[PDB]
């Protein structure tokens, strides 16, 4: 690890141009998260965002050690700011007058290109969990509010402690969205010895194992199927516990980079925090494959449920839906997609016939050549169907990249009703 | 002073084979043509290969350059050391001659300029790329004496091709890396919006709420107020008491951008209630009403068993002339023009004994403020303010410069708005100078007019 005062130099001058940037993260993409997360938020505004004069410091760099360049900053900030917040609904102001913040910050530069600047992109995330303290005024308010109950001090550090780690990631593109995984992680949740349910975190998705009653040493005998998007940096994350009437039994934490490397694993491992534990896991790491040439063996190995490939879904939008003249005979399009039982719905669109949604879906797949993607346009309002499409994923299989691009005709429909979507398959291959 | 970064060489050696294709690139489209058009005899020369080996470039020291800074660029002095075998070949076809480099040694300072800087990621415009001394350099040849014999490069010798080539790494030659497009800098430090919708918040009806238990024996008529959003801006109106179909009659102007999926988004709500507070909610896609463009009608509320809302949409052009001005001010707090302004700089401020700068932007009661500057009678702002106009035939803009400090004024300025509207695109780019302030105060700033007309 080195350090970089010349680094420290050039964030401090740069400093009123980051905290534009801080500025315009917090009012475009942080506020919107905030007023999506409960009803009762959205009325919820930044009125102020302002982290002072002081800049961060970087206090070490490390290159970690292949078309991805990976550097470890040490970040430390300690400054007073004034941050403030609003829900005129309840007429609740509250603010953030100190933040301390240490951690790792990632930095990850891909894709590498034969031209300059040589990066074509910048990946800026928290490792593991950031150390954060935040002194707040009139934070009794935003406790008082319906619906935030359940929040405390220490709830909402918690929250914006997991806000900066991955899956969130800062992305900057240095050559001019919808980024595919990296990697699929099957989690084989096997057995336990000395000591009851397991709780499994891969970032956002939690698995949660059935209880065995009266045993010590159970056979859960369950798998979960993991989406890594950001690798490395992302961990796997388990604790078993034991109900009461909430009893810990040990917990465990494993960096996925020694999955990916080795491929690959059936170990026994001993619990963290705990005299007596061992839990034993069957970790994979899957690799999207942008052809079906091993799909036929995947399907044969995983016969004797379990994935064989992965779609990606961009929903774009959609045009000459079914409506009248005036607005308000126009409906509210809302979307469900399906591949068999899993079903997945985009946000709610408003009185109109030609929604905009670009937003993203992914769906695990037992056997691309048996299943259908069924996409349905319905109007909130009424109650009713606006149109649907069919697409056999054996049309993938053949497609170039396996993906699909096109504005698709929509049946049962308007006679010029259109919805625009890009649709993409990964075949989910050992090695 | 100076430091070492053997983080930085660790990734410039992961990252040499990609270097390796941008130096091939350089040669064969910046330096070849270069070459070809410096000499009648060399108009047939060509680079047949171009390999530059396994070895990368070495950093040996980086530094941080501070004194004479302006504060819209970062200067890097890089320490550079390469020492590695090659393959670079020559060819004139014009005299069959063909010579190559076989290994070269280059040590001197390279100077990375970081600029411009903007209120953004990726924070830097583009790179400045040049050495700031001729660089030592050292040229192994197979044939060299063949290219001496060229009638075009007769009477040269080594070390005269040496300091040619020695001069070529330097000023006024550089190699310019964009980071960001002119276009988005541009519409970053001055966004144009892309329309404004007028918002008549008149009345509602049949304000009532879903508890129904007991509702009237124990609590009155609710308070309704309504809670207004287009994008990050919010308007709340006032509160009519005791009414379940109030006219509040407000009237809200916001600013419309490029988002996709953006609506406008009304709650109503009570002002003294029990636990029941909704009364109701509008959303309505902005492409609709930019479609439509002009719309009066009676909404029905969501999320509650009854309840209507009027509303009336107005979808306003920006026009970047004043043909349509004298209309629409027959047609109409309502405004008939907007204003952007981009607050670059100033300079020579009243002056440790330097003081924080902040300016203050008003058309008459409607008032703006920028960041706090520190220390500084130079301060660089770069910030953006948008105002909606009543008149532009009768209204003017006032700039005051304030010190924070000793709390008050550096200066001020005043532009009647009257003289936008004879400019060209509305507009006026200028330093201004200031009054009531040093004999040679300054202040830098863009200021654009435009016509909001209904189509
Ligand atoms: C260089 C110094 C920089 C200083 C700090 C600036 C950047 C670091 C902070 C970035 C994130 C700030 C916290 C916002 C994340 C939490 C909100 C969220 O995303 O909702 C998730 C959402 C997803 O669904 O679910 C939620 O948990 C909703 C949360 C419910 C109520 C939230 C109340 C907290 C209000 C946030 C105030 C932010 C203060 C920032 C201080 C740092
Ligand atoms: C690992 C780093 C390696 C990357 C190498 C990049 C740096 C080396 C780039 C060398 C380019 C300079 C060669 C001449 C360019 C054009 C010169 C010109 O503009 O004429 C100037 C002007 C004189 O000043 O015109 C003149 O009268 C002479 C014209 C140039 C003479 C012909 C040059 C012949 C040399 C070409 C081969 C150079 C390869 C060496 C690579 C090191
Ligand atoms: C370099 C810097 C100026 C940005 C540093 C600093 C400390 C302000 C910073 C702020 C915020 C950071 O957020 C990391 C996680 O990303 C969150 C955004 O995810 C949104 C959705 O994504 C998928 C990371 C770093
Ligand atoms: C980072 C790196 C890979 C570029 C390093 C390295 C050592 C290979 C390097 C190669 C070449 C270098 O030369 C810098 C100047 O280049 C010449 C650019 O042409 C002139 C075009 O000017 C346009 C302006 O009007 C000038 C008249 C500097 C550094």
Not at 145 to 151: A, D, T
Not at 231 to 254: A, K, R, Y
Not at 386 to 405: A, F
Request: proline share 6%.
């Amino acid at each position: 690890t080195e350090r970089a005062e010349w680094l420290n130099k050039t964030v401090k001058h740069m400093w009123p141009f980051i905290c534009q940037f801080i500025e315009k993260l917090f009012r475009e993409t942080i506020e919107p998260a905030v007023r999506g997360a409960n009803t009762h938020l959205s009325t919820f505004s930044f009125t102020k965002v302002d982290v002072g004069q002081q800049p961060l410091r970087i206090n070490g760099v490390k290159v970690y050690t292949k078309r991805q360049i990976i550097l470890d900053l040490q970040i430390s900030f300690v400054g007073n700011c004034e941050i403030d917040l609003e829900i005129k609904r309840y007429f609740c102001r509250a603010g953030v007058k100190s933040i301390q913040i240490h951690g790792t910050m990632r930095v990850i530069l891909e894709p590498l290109i034969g031209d300059m600047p040589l990066v074509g992109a910048l990946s800026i995330f928290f490792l593991r969990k950031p150390l954060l303290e935040i002194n707040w005024t009139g934070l009794t308010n935003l406790l008082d509010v319906p619906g935030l109950n359940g929040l405390s001090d220490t709830i909402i550090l918690d929250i914006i402690s997991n806000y900066l780690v991955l899956p969130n990631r800062i992305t900057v593109p240095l050559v001019s969205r919808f980024p595919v995984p990296k990697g699929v992680l099957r989690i084989h949740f096997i057995e336990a010895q000395d000591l009851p349910y397991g709780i499994i975190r891969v970032g956002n998705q939690i698995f949660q194992s059935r209880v065995i009653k009266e045993n010590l040493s159970p056979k859960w005998n369950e798998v979960y199927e993991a989406l890594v998007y950001e690798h490395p940096g992302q961990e796997l994350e388990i604790e078993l516990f034991d109900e009461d009437p909430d009893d810990f039994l040990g917990s465990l934490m494993i960096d996925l980079i020694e999955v990916e490397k080795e491929r690959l694993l059936d170990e026994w491992f001993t619990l963290d925090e705990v005299p007596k534990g061992k839990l034993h896991l069957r970790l994979e790491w899957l690799t999207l494959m942008p052809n079906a040439s091993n799909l036929d063996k995947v399907l044969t190995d995983i016969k004797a449920g379990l994935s064989s490939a992965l779609l990606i879904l961009y929903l774009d939008s959609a045009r000459n839906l079914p409506s009248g003249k005036k607005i308000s005979s126009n409906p509210n399009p809302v979307v469900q997609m399906s591949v068999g039982h899993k079903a997945q719905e985009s946000k709610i669109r408003y009185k109109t016939n030609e929604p905009v949604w670009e937003e993203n879906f992914t769906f695990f797949i037992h056997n691309p050549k048996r299943q259908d993607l069924e996409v349905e346009v319905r109007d909130e309002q009424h109650q009713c169907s606006l149109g649907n499409l069919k697409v056999p994923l054996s049309q993938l299989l053949t497609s170039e990249d396996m993906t699909v691009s096109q504005r698709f005709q929509l049946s049962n429909s308007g006679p010029n009703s259109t919805i625009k979507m890009k649709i993409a398959l990964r075949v989910l291959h050992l090695e």
